[PDB]
Structure formats: C-alpha cells, structure tokens
Paper text:
All these three CESH[L]s exhibit high sequence identity (>60%) with L-2-haloacid dehalogenases, which are members of the haloacid dehalogenase (HAD)-like superfamily. Studies have shown that both [name][L] and KlCESH[L] adopt a two-step catalytic reaction mechanism by 18O-labeling studies.
In [name][L], the key residues involved in hydrophilic interactions include R124, R145, Q150, and D152, while L128, F137, V141, L159, and L176 participate in hydrophobic interactions. Furthermore, similar hydrophilic and hydrophobic interactions at the dimer interface are also observed in KlCESH[L]. The core domains of both [name][L] and KlCESH[L] can be well superimposed (with an r.s.m.d value of 0.944 Å), while there are some notable differences in the cap domain. Although the previously proposed catalytic triad of [name][L] consists of D18, H190, and D193 (22), D193 should not be the catalytic residue in the catalytic triad because D193 does not form direct interaction with H190 in the solved [name][L] structure.
Residue numbers in the entry:
A (entry chain A), B (entry chain B): 11 to 247
C-alpha cells in the first residue's frame, strides 16, 4: 500500500497551545492574566491561518516565523490598553512556537512506524522551525520537508507532489497524516492516502475540534501508536 | 562555537566500496568473479567522480541516480565478454548506492554529538537516495539536505549557503565534516569550520587515500566519536 507517511506537525503531533500559554505567562508575569493571555493565543492562531490562507490564493510564500511575529505585533496593539511588550519580549514570545512539546503518544508511535515505513514531516513552518521543534517535541524523522523548500504552502498541490518527487515515490504511495481535514482533503486530490488524528485538547481543555465520522478518511485514530497498529506495525518493547 | 554539524555522507560516513562489492556479488552470483567485480566498482566510482567534476564546472545539476545508472550501462558493455545483466538487474545493481553501510564508529558517534549539536546531512546524492542510505547505514539526522534541493553540487558555495539558510544558522556556526578535502576547503570559503575524517579503506585495502597534515583543517580525527570528544561531547552509556 504505502511507502511513506507524511506528517502534519503543529497540532497533529505538537501541543502548541499549552506551550504558548505557559511560555507567555512566564515571560509577561503578573502583567497578564490567564483568560487575557489565552484569548490572545487563540486569536494569534487564527491570524496565522488567515494570513496563510491569503498567501495560498495569491500563490506567494514568506517566512512563517515572520507571519507569527507580524500577527502577534498586531494583536499586542489591540491589547495596548491592558499591557505592553518590548521588542525583545516579542521575540521571546514568538519563539514559543519553536519549543512545542509533542502529545505523549507521538515519539513511541513514530518509532513504531519506522519499522515498515519511511516517516517524513511536511510542514508549513519554516525549515529551521521544524528542525528546532524536533528537539523539544522529541521528533525523529527520515526527512524534514517544509513549505520553504517548495515556495508554497499546503493545501497547494505543489507541496504534496514535490514531497513525493523528492522522496522518489508516487503520491499514491504516501499516507498523509494530520489532525486538520483541509490538509487531508488536498492530499486526497493528488492521490495520497488519508489518516486523521483526533486531538481533543488541540484547542484547549474547552473548545472542540472536528468530530470526524468514520469513512471520511482511510483511517481515523486517537494516537500515532494506534495508526501504527492498523498499518501492521508491531508494538515496541 | 558551533550550533550544527554538516556531514558529507558517501565515504565520510559510509563504506560504499564494500557495500557495492557484496551487493553486486549477491545479485550476480557465479556469473562474475570477485576480483573482476571489484574492478568494475572501482571504475564505476571513478566515472561518477569525473562526471560530477565536469557538471560542477559547467554549473549543471542532474539526477545522481541517473549518473550511476548511465555509467553502469557503459561498464557492463565494456565487461560484456565476462558477464551480462538484465534490465531489471541493472536497476538492482544501481540500487546498491542507496543501501550503503556505515563505518562502525558512525552511528554511536552521531548519537553522541546530538546532545550538544544539530546534525544534518549535506550530500550530492539525490534526496531519495540519502533518505534510503539513512536506513541501511543507521544514520539519524535532525535534517537531510541534498544537492537536488539547490540545483547545484558541492563544492558550489550555493550548497553550503543554502544549507545555512535552511537550518537558520550562521555559516560561522557550522562545522563541516568530510573525508574529502575539496568539500572542506569550499566550506571554509563560505565561513564554516572544518573537520577532516581519515578513511584509509575508502578506496579499498589496496589503492590510496589523501594526505592531510595536522593544522590544515580545524579538526583531524580517525572517527566521528573522536571528533565528538574534541568538541566537548560527553561519552554515551
């Protein structure tokens, strides 16, 4: 069936929200409260995807770190009555995105898959960012692929097809793995397999995610270890 | 001093000659004698080098797999009196270059360096080839980089500069590691440190290797683990 598994990373494998909440509360200290900062974090994620959505239609690529920084600065202006931050603090706050921890199933799941499949990241994050998160989130890849290599973000066909060309495999022999349906739907359009990972805590203990029904994608799992089971990979020691 | 180590792979970390000799004898069996096959492998490697030297001068890039395949077809014609190969066998023999075994020091040496440094591959081999070599050679990277990503082979400055921009690290904070002096000299020009790894068996128990004196490059070692020691990395368990 498949030769390689292509992974979305942010949210799919990493809990970005907990880190950005705790990191921002560490940096800003007594100057911001949980509900103020949590509301900021949630609008920040929206601003990034809205800018990335705009860039895809326009067929342009830019530093994704710069996207995060630009949208944070815009949000800090909105909240300028409540608190402020220096340029250095804006840099440290923006760095939170590159210190993500992975969900607890991920490292054992990724290793268990490596016995039958090549495992690569295909991320919209900049190349250096995914390399950096790899250390804090304990990710170990066969290859790292980023929108920066292709000059185009997912859901663009160029990213999935370029990933397949670089890997030397037909798109039909890629299983694409993601906790975001848009990413899986685009991969299906190039012939790739689809595997959805439910992440109920991706947007916090409250706040819900897509209750995906069975049969929309080829697999629907609650962990990478579970996906590995269904792909004929044995459990580790 | 250094944030990342950039590794050449073929030869520096992998014994391509032992691999291709035993790989060919497995495919061809009794139809060729070992000493004859050894002569083809040594000329095959020579063809590959002469071809890459000319493509570098012309500033062109082409699939390195096709370089191996086209040069093999020429040598099979030259040796056609002694043995022959089917079209399928030509593909299998060319696959040997994507199944290289690593020198015995390398896997633990790479692991020991990961405690303090980012480790990435930078090879002239195509992207799919270096991914496959990671399994056969048991290499574990933070990132994998290929001349295919840049449309230019080492020693072109664009390859070292592209790697630095992809990893987000200043070339002065990159240590280049190789058993080939051309590669280290070119990285020195871009601003990186240099580490020469002596591989006397790279071209066989017979044949010869390069002369590097002490003080020509920043480090001169006999194994990756020695390099890690000289870089302040604690030993493994």
């Amino acid at each position: 069936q498949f030769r390689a598994l292509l992974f979305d990373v942010q949210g799919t494998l990493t809990d970005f929200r907990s880190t950005l909440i705790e990191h921002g509360l560490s940096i800003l200290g007594d100057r911001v409260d949980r509900e103020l900062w949590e509301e900021l974090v949630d609008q920040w994620r929206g601003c990034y995807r809205d800018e990335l959505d705009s860039l895809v239609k326009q067929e342009k690529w830019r530093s994704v770190r710069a996207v995060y920084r630009d949208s944070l600065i815009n949000l800090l202006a909105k909240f300028s009555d409540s608190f402020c931050a220096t340029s250095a603090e804006v840099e440290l706050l923006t760095d939170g995105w590159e210190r993500l921890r992975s969900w607890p199933d991920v490292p054992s799941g990724l290793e268990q898959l490596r016995s039958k499949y090549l495992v690569a990241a295909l991320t919209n994050a900049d190349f250096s960012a995914i390399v950096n998160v790899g250390r804090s989130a304990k990710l170990q890849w066969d290859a790292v692929l980023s929108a920066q290599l292709f000059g185009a973000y997912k859901p663009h066909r160029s990213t999935y097809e370029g990933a397949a060309t670089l890997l030397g495999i037909a798109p039909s022999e890629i299983l694409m793995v993601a906790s975001h349906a848009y990413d899986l739907e685009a991969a299906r359009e190039v012939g790739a397999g689809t595997a959805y990972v439910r992440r109920p805590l991706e947007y916090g203990p409250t706040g819900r995610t897509e209750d995906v029904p069975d049969g929309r994608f080829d697999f629907l799992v609650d962990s990478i270890s579970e996906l590995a089971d269904q792909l004929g990979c044995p459990r580790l020691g």
